[PDB]
């Protein structure tokens, strides 16, 4: 099956070519050098952390 990892923070947001929202994910137990852009539809129960990002930007 496909692998899930704990999210510490949402640090940024962009639109891809296709128009889909991508989020820059800080992974819990890792630092910024390991942040990755993930499709919105890769995020599980991250609504509160998307709220926090939107409040900070």
């Amino acid at each position: 099956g496909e692998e899930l990892y704990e999210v510490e923070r949402i640090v940024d947001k962009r639109k891809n070519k296709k128009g889909k929202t991508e989020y820059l994910v800080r992974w819990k137990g890792y630092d910024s050098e390991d942040d990755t852009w993930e499709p919105e539809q890769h995020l599980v129960n991250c609504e509160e952390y998307i709220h926090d990002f939107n409040r900070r930007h």
């Binding site: 496909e2 692998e3 899930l4 990892y5 704990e6 999210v7 994910v25 992974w27 990755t36 993930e38 890769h42 995020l43 599980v44 129960n45 991250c46």
Partner: peptide, 5 residues
Amino acid sequence: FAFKA
């Protein structure tokens, strides 16, 4: 959580 790809 997120799928990492």
